[PDB]
Write a protein that binds this DNA or RNA. Structure first.
Ligand SMILES: [Mg+2]
Ligand SMILES: [Zn+2]
Ligand SMILES: [Zn+2]
Ligand SMILES: [Zn+2]
Ligand SMILES: [Zn+2]
Lengths: 254, 115, 98, 240, 526, 77, 240, 66, 35, 98, 44
RNA sequence: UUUUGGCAUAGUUGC
């Protein structure tokens, strides 16, 4: 009638992705954890682009949209930052946003590449993660791009710019022991990288008493957060959501 | 034009209750929890934890419409155990599970970094 | 002077004739633009090729919207002059009508 | 000439008496929605805020229509006009005068079309009774008419770019007429060939063929999930 | 034929037809005849040799071109009249090789059969695997597809223009696309599309889209509309002047704002405008004065992109104002493959809600399985498989129609080498519950086109407004607004319903109510 | 001397409910015990089920004659 | 709702593997096509030697055309039947066909085995050129591929001549769709404008605007078409 | 028009790889080898660099209106 | 000496590329107008 | 003006006799995508005329092999009357027979 | 009232009364200068 | 301080 005792095993940990296995858990918790990786981990991404001068070939909304998609280093600052909608200010004070400034004038005849290197932050902890650098726009001789933009805390549910993951691989039952999928010709299907069968089998023998468990993860970070930070913030956020729901339920019952 | 704002899928507006309980008159000891501004993230996990309880005769959830943001969770229980009690116990179990998972994930990170 | 003739773009008399892609860019003209159209009051007008029966050729048909068993049409037209084309028919009367 | 004015498809008697442009009509692209009942039609918020229905003021709805008058056109759901007993018309997007916002029994408020309003829904060409049918309005937050999938085959419609028309009855008697004669549940059986005009369609038909196979087995959580979507369920889980 | 093939006294386009049975030699030289080049065949051998191919390989820095091929008497132009006297080989590799003889006297040989197709039909990958009506439907939809219609679109001011943010050349392409410049000006995006039944919004030729992909600019587009206007001087009857109308000096205006304009009566570029805002303040003198300023269309909205001012043919000042409007894909926008799979966006789901493979790939689009069978657009499936092979291999696939070096077996064997199921299927996981989907989903990249028919350009409603001046009924003007015709079909449909009150309400109360006074004795309106 | 059917036609039901709902919307007296009913159509339906609608249907036969049926007299389908 | 939600667990697709048959099935189809072509050549040789005799009521061209047409039809349906037998139970084409959701068995045969004869105005492809369907054939060639019998499936892809003849075949589909739309409404508006005033009067007779008896009772029984249904008279067929 | 910042499907950063991709192609790499060297394993990411058409280079031929 | 079938696939498209380099796609309109 | 009007409106023949003039020859060039522009520039229009009523022109005829596209034509009341040239199809410009 | 010449890109202050022509190249197409208002986009 | 509008064509395109 109570919680499982989930067990973690980290298989691989790089600076761009983390691979790990969770055993002793129901499918729903693992799926919700993957869902929270994708859509509920808050990061800092550019919003509120104010353009002072844009004589580039790309129109203003195009440049603003490209700026929004630049990932920003938000490893340790995002937790203590606040959502701008909740802050008590003109919507931009240092406690809920990070100012950015871009001012590029192409004077030389050669094509000038406006990269993420040219984005100057007012806070050193928040920079573009590439600082090759992400190309924003190419400028001709005599063209200018000059703007200022801020970066607010949001999560991927609101807009995909705040999604920290560059693809979350998720798997369970690599040998199809539970037969949650039914291969018409199981011999034709390649073995998963976590499969434990020999090269004469195609599926594990069917298990009627089986239950999903030993969920394999591979969380690749876009760069704005370390992958371990993505997973820890994800679990913290899901726990926070459930605790807030318990608070509201207790108020309703009372 | 008619596109809804992106923020109104997780944000409660003024005078909107996060969660509302209504007894189901068709069956004794059955309740419907309508939670606003939620999705399958909490619905599926709460349903799964409720199914783990032995005293819960029925636990299911549905999103009435994907463009709208509500989950209706129907919970029916044995006559000696209220659905509200089962719901609270399920959430406390999930919170304990995720706290334990946070602790063990931190330990695994420290081991892999030291290793 | 007798008038002004519209000029198909990128023809032998359009100013973009035989210009390299660089010069087309300097005139703000797309080098991939195929041309083949006129500019009339700023609007780009294209002449759709009109299909019509060939001329000066004998064509024998069998009409039954008339009293003839057969009919040899010949839309004879002058060469390069006198655009009005003279259509002669030589028909065989139907033997059913008697 | 005068003879040309009346003859033909676009004459006065065939272009402006047998058929004519009508007020209180909207048109837009249709899209599927399996989560609507067959008698429900999704409506964009803008169309609902643009079209109106005249609701007569009674002592039962005096407070509600007063609130809608307070909202006005800028906020949905609201109202466009107040037609007083004298017939004079007060517009609500220009008049902040609180004296003009007084309501009393016999007044009519042209309130914005809201949920549950009856609307005739049509696809041209109109070829039989089921090509125009009554639906209940459901406000959903996008720019297309959402429909149930079963009502596509009477309309002979597919969501490849088809547009459909929506007429709003403006009177209680016409609303009752559409309720009792033209609602799509009443139009299930056609008299053309004494059979149902709409059945189960592509995905759900293939899926129910696969579902009712002899060897489909569902565990406890799966059936408990499925019974949530059964509206007529009495709440008793059957014996497995 | 000797003289024509040598480019002697007879020019190439002259066509000689010998009717042997009727003993006639008709030579045609006039214009209007259609012809095409065919390779000449002599004694069951092509006159084209490897030397010509070598010279054409160095087409640059040799001055050997097509005209030298024609002059060499290897290829000649044949017209449809002379085709009746021609025995033509489809391909030299087999049709003229020695075997059990079908025809030992071939006069010409096709260059490649794929050149029978036009321009819009030649961008179809694997059109010989489709049903021909869908080839026709694609030949229309490719005309209707969004893209970068021209590289100098910035300077041009056309009345309507659609430009896609991130167009891509197709991963599965035809050879003939190299010569259409489609590789330089593509119209569409390669989309990871999964052909699967799902929550139910893809049914009946509609499409589920990945909301997170759209947030990343997937099929995001910009819509340019340009308004032109000119101030004129017609003797002394009146005079139009560009200037912002002031509320005191002109006795005719609308409730729209007039402060967006500058002192010259024109709106500056980089200013947002609603569907009623004024952009060209123009005042016509009253024999005070009146306004005839122009506003945006009622439904439209955007930012003023560019404003040019110049003198017309008459030397009168006139300006053209381009209005940028950024269009994001939403519910209702049309999309289509290169196979006639027309469909609207049924609903948009975030990335977590979409189904996903074992490697975290969510499809950009989901289409209904039932769009295929009655269609028999097998070319769509072969395109998806070939595109998956192309994306894994890192090489633009080839989908020339009548090519035997490529077939589904070879594509499947290539795909199996990359650790995928040979038929392109994959084990997808339900995005909601995380459970494996029982059947394995066919998924892979496919080239999709956004058609210009957005929902916002075709949504309109009416309560009441600009009636006619003659019929006193609603009419179309300033927008799509003006009601919908309750035609004879709808009239008789309501007659069959027996809904007399609603029919009367439609035709009389809510279209053009009126009342007249008539004498009782006579019958004429008094 | 009534020859017509004793059943309310669907058209008769439609027009009766429409007119009675309009009357109720105009503050007409209500001949049924309502409970929190605000929509005139629902009140009219409650009246029709109670057979308390005070309307007489005049059915015109195709010879100029007619028959006057009370709503209570007819069989509600 | 219930079936659409269960389908998220089941799921349904369509792919290349659903259009693939085993090698034995392809060999059988190719053997059938070879046999059909050989006996068509036999019929042609009988016709050329004046050995073919005309059937009663048909000229010799009609007799030859009927023979080759029935030959290719039986070849096509035999190949389609054999391809249908090769279908697995997991094959999604079969799942969508047996459920009646979409497609037909002919569609599966065309996708898998043989697209079949292409017809223009109910005949094989005519000699547009001088006694030829295209420049790639010899004069007076009445073989299957010469006159527009395409033998490759859509999976295998059509050859150039086969593709062109298939385009010719589909052109008639597009044109007759166009002329159907041209005749949409015209017959219907003529019928309704003849009959719109006919009504069931309160004496249960059916009369027009001028009040003339058309039927003494509607449908000769006085019953609406809504609530009638098929039954079997139990005493008509049995013997004494 | 220009290289997108994110991969449309998975969201991986791709905008910082177009110039490197072209540089590898100038080094006589097969396109598969170039994409593998840039570390794009999922074919969703590979599709974007493999199929991108860089029109901004062509748009920069026109002089700016300043 | 002669084009072998294995190389014919390259050869024919070389010919067609030369055709479109020489002529282009709108020779009809331009040649008619020049004449 | 005489050419200009005829190219501006697409009415061909005498301006004052435009009642019996052939219409739609000149059309505004369709600039929506590059493929549409090329397809519009390579377009053939077959008028109805008296001869089209004698024999049905909408059907795809065998002689259209290699000259026009076999599958490209607008739907509605224009199928088979509006065609597009094949890729390598080239129209004779005319020459003197002397 | 500043415009930019389409050809030589010269800033010209032109009144609402006089004809429009480049004061140093004679070119007859003039583009309005970008607005000095406050313009903001959310980066979505 | 409460307006508003060209008519008839021709072409193209959607279902
Ligand atoms: Mg449709
Ligand atoms: Zn703040
Ligand atoms: Zn009188
Ligand atoms: Zn990717
Ligand atoms: Zn200048």
């Amino acid at each position: 009638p109570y919680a499982n005792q989930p067990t973690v095993r980290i298989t691989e940990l790089t600076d761009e992705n983390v691979k790990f296995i969770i055993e002793n858990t129901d499918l729903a918790v693992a799926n919700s954890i993957r869902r929270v990786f994708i859509a509920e981990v808050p990061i800092i991404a550019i919003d509120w682009v104010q353009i002072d001068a844009n004589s580039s070939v790309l129109h203003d909304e195009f440049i603003a949209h490209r700026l929004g998609l630049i990932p920003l280093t938000s490893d340790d600052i995002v937790d203590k930052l606040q959502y701008s909608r909740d802050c008590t200010c003109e919507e931009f004070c240092p406690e809920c946003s990070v100012e950015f400034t871009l001012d590029v004038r192409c004077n030389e005849d050669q094509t000038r590449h406006v990269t993420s290197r040219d984005l100057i932050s007012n806070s050193p902890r928040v920079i573009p993660v590439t600082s090759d650098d992400i190309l924003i726009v190419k400028l001709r001789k005599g063209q200018e791009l000059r703007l200022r933009a801020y970066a607010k805390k949001g999560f991927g549910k609101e807009h995909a710019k705040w999604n920290p993951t560059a693809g979350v691989a998720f798997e369970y039952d690599p040998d199809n022991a539970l037969r949650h999928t039914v291969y018409p010709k199981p011999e034709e299907w390649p073995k998963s990288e976590y499969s434990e069968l020999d090269e004469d089998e195609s599926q594990a023998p069917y298990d009627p008493n089986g239950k999903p468990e030993r969920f394999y993860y591979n969380v690749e970070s876009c760069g704005s957060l370390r992958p371990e930070t993505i997973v820890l913030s994800a679990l913290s956020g899901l726990k926070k959501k459930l605790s807030d729901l318990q608070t509201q339920l207790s108020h309703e019952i009372q | 034009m008619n596109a809804p704002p992106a923020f109104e899928s997780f944000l409660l507006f003024e005078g909107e209750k996060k969660i509302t309980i209504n007894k189901d008159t068709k069956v004794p000891n059955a309740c419907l929890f309508t939670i606003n501004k939620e999705d399958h993230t909490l619905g599926n996990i709460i349903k799964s934890q409720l199914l783990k309880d032995p005293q819960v005769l029925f636990a299911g959830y549905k999103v009435p419409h994907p463009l709208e943001h509500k989950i209706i969770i129907r919970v029916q229980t044995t006559p000696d155990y209220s659905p509200q009690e089962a719901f609270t116990n399920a959430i406390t179990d999930l919170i304990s599970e995720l706290s334990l998972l946070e602790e063990r994930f931190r330990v695994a990170i420290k081991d892999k970094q030291e290793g | 002077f007798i008038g002004k003739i519209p000029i198909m773009l990128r023809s032998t008399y359009c100013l973009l004739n035989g210009l390299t892609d660089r010069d087309l860019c300097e005139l703000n003209e797309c080098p991939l633009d195929p041309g083949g159209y006129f500019i009339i009051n700023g609007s780009e007008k294209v002449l759709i090729a009109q299909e019509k029966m060939a001329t000066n050729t004998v064509y024998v048909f069998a009409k039954k919207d008339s009293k003839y068993a057969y009919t040899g049409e010949c839309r004879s037209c002058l060469e390069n002059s006198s655009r009005p084309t003279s259509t002669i028919w030589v028909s065989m009367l139907a033997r059913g009508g008697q | 000439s005068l003879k040309q004015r009346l003859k033909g498809k676009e004459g006065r008697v065939r272009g402006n008496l047998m058929g004519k442009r009508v007020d209180f009509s909207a048109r837009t692209v249709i899209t599927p929605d399996p989560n609507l009942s067959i008698d429900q039609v999704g409506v964009p918020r803008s169309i609902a805020a643009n079209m109106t229905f005249a609701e007569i003021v009674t002592p039962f709805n005096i407070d509600r229509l007063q609130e809608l008058v307070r909202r006005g056109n800028s906020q949905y759901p609201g109202a466009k006009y107040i037609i007083r007993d004298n017939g004079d018309r007060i517009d609500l997007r220009f008049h902040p005068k609180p004296s003009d916002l007084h309501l009393q029994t016999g007044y009519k408020v042209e309130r914005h079309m809201c949920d549950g309003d009856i609307v005739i829904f049509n696809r041209q060409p109109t070829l039989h009774k089921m090509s125009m049918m009554g639906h209940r309005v459901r406000i959903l937050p996008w720019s297309t008419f959402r429909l149930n999938l079963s009502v596509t085959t009477p309309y002979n419609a597919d969501f490849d770019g088809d547009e459909m028309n929506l007429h709003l009855p403006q009177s209680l008697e016409t609303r009752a007429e559409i309720q009792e004669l033209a609602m799509v549940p009443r139009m299930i059986v056609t008299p053309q060939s004494n059979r149902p005009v709409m059945g189960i369609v592509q995905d759900t038909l293939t899926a129910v063929r696969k579902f009712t196979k002899r060897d489909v087995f569902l565990e406890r959580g799966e059936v408990m999930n499925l019974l949530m979507f059964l509206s007529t369920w009495d709440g008793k889980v059957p014996q497995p | 034929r000797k003289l024509r093939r040598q480019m002697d006294i007879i020019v190439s386009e002259v066509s000689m037809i010998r009717d042997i049975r009727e003993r006639e030699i008709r030579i045609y030289t006039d214009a209007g005849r259609i012809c095409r080049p065919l390779l000449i065949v002599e004694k069951q051998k092509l006159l084209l040799k490897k030397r010509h191919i070598d010279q054409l390989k160095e087409r640059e820095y040799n001055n050997y071109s097509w005209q030298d091929l024609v002059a060499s008497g290897v290829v000649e132009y044949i017209d449809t009249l002379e085709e009746e006297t021609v025995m033509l080989a489809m391909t030299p590799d087999d049709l003229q090789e020695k075997e059990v003889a079908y025809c030992s006297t071939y006069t010409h040989c096709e260059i490649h059969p794929s050149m029978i197709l036009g321009v819009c039909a030649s961008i179809i990958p694997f059109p010989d695997h489709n049903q021909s009506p869908r080839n026709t439907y694609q030949s229309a939809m490719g005309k209707q597809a969004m893209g970068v219609y021209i590289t100098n679109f910035h300077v041009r001011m056309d009345t309507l223009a659609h430009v896609l943010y991130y167009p891509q050349k197709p991963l599965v392409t035809t050879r003939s696309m190299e010569y259409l410049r489609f590789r330089e000006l593509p119209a569409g995006i390669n989309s990871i599309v999964a052909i699967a039944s799902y929550t139910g919004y893809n049914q009946e030729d509609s499409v589920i889209m990945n909301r997170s992909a759209v947030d990343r600019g997937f099929f995001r587009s910009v819509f340019y509309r340009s308004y032109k206007e000119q101030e004129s001087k017609k003797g002394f009857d009146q005079e139009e002047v560009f200037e912002k109308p002031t509320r005191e000096t002109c006795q005719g205006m609308r409730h729209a704002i007039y402060d967006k304009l500058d002192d010259d009566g024109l709106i500056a570029p980089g200013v947002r405008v609603s569907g009623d805002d004024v952009i060209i303040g123009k005042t016509v003198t009253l024999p005070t004065k009146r306004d005839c300023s122009t506003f945006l269309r009622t439904s439209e909205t955007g930012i003023v992109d560019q404003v040019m001012v110049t003198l017309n043919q008459e030397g009168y000042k006139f300006c053209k104002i381009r209005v940028r409007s950024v269009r994001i894909p939403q519910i209702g926008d049309k999309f289509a493959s290169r196979h006639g799979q027309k469909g609207t966006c049924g609903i948009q789901y975030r990335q977590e809600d979409m189904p996903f493979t074992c490697e975290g790939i969510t499809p950009d689009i989901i289409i209904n399985p039932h769009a295929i069978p009655s269609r028999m657009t097998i070319g769509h499936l072969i395109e998806c498989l070939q595109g998956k092979v192309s994306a894994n291999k890192g090489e633009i696939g080839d989908a020339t129609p009548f090519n035997d070096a490529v077939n589904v077996q070879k594509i499947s064997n290539l795909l199996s080498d990359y650790g995928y199921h040979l038929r392109g299927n994959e084990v997808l996981y339900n995005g909601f519950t995380g459970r494996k989907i029982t059947s394995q989903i066919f998924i892979g990249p496919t080239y999709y086109q956004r058609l210009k028919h957005m929902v916002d350009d075709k949504i309109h409603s009416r309560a009441r407004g600009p009636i006619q001046i003659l019929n006193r009924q609603p009419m179309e003007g300033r927008s799509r607004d003006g009601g919908l015709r309750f035609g004879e079909m709808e009239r008789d449909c309501q007659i069959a319903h027996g809904a007399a009150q609603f029919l009367r309400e439609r035709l009389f109360e809510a279209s053009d109510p009126y009342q007249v006074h008539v004498c009782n004795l006579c019958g004429i309106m008094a | 001397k009534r020859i017509t059917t004793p059943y309310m036609t669907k058209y008769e039901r439609a027009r009766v409910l429409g007119t009675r709902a309009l009357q109720i919307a105009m503050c007409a007296p209500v001949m049924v015990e309502l409970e929190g009913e605000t929509d005139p159509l629902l009140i009219a339906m409650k009246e029709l089920k109670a057979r308390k609608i005070p309307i007489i249907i005049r059915r015109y036969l195709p010879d100029g004659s007619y028959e006057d049926w009370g709503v209570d007299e007819l069989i509600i389908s | 709702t219930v079936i659409n939600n269960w389908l998220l667990i089941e799921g349904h697709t369509i792919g290349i593997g659903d259009s693939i048959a085993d090698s034995k099935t392809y060999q059988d189809i190719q053997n059938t096509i070879k046999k059909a072509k050989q006996d068509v050549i036999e019929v042609i040789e009988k016709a050329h030697n004046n050995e073919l005799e005309p059937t009663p009521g048909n000229t010799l061209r009609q007799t030859f055309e009927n023979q080759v047409n029935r030959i290719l039809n039986d070849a096509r349906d035999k190949t389609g039947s054999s391809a249908q037998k090769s279908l697995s139970e997991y094959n999604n084409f079969k799942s969508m066909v047996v459920s009646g959701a979409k497609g037909s068995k002919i569609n599966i045969s065309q996708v898998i085995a043989v697209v079949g004869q292409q017809n223009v105005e109910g005949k094989r492809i005519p000699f547009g050129f001088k006694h030829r369907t295209l420049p790639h054939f010899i004069k007076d060639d009445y073989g299957p591929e010469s006159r527009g019998f395409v033998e490759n499936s859509y999976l295998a892809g059509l050859t150039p001549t086969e593709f062109f003849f298939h385009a010719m075949g589909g052109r008639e589909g597009l044109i007759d769709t166009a002329v159907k739309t041209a005749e949409t409404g015209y017959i219907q508006r003529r019928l309704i404008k003849s009959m719109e005033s006919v009504m069931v009067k309160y004496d249960a007779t059916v009369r027009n605007s001028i009040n003339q008896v058309v039927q003494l009772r509607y449908g000769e029984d006085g019953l609406a078409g809504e609530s009638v249904e098929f039954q079997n008279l139990a005493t008509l067929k049995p013997s004494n | 028009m220009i290289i997108p910042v994110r991969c449309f499907t998975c969201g991986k950063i791709v905008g910082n790889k177009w110039e490197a991709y072209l540089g590898l192609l100038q080094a006589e790499y097969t396109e598969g080898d170039a994409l593998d060297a840039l570390g794009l394993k999922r074919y969703c990411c590979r599709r974007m660099l493999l199929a991108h058409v860089d029109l901004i280079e062509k748009l920069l031929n026109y002089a700016p209106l300043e | 000496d002669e084009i072998t079938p294995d190389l014919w696939q390259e050869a024919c498209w070389i010919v067609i590329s030369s055709y479109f380099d020489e002529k282009g796609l709108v020779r009809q309109q331009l040649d008619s107008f020049d004449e | 003006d005489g050419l200009k009007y005829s190219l501006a409106t697409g009415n061909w023949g005498d301006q004052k006799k435009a009642h019996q003039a052939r219409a739609g020859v000149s059309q505004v060039l369709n600039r929506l995508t590059f493929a549409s522009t090329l397809s519009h520039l390579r377009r053939l229009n077959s008028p109805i005329g008296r001869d089209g009523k004698l024999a049905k022109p909408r059907q795809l005829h065998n002689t259209l092999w290699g000259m026009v596209c076999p599958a490209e034509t607008p739907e509605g009341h224009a199928v088979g009357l509006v065609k597009n040239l094949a890729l390598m199809a080239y129209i004779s410009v005319g020459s003197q027979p002397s | 009232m500043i415009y930019i010449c389409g050809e030589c890109h010269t800033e010209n202050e032109i009144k609402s009364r006089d004809p429009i022509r480049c004061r140093e190249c004679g070119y007859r197409i003039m583009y309005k200068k970008r607005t000095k208002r406050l313009v903001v986009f959310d980066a979505r």
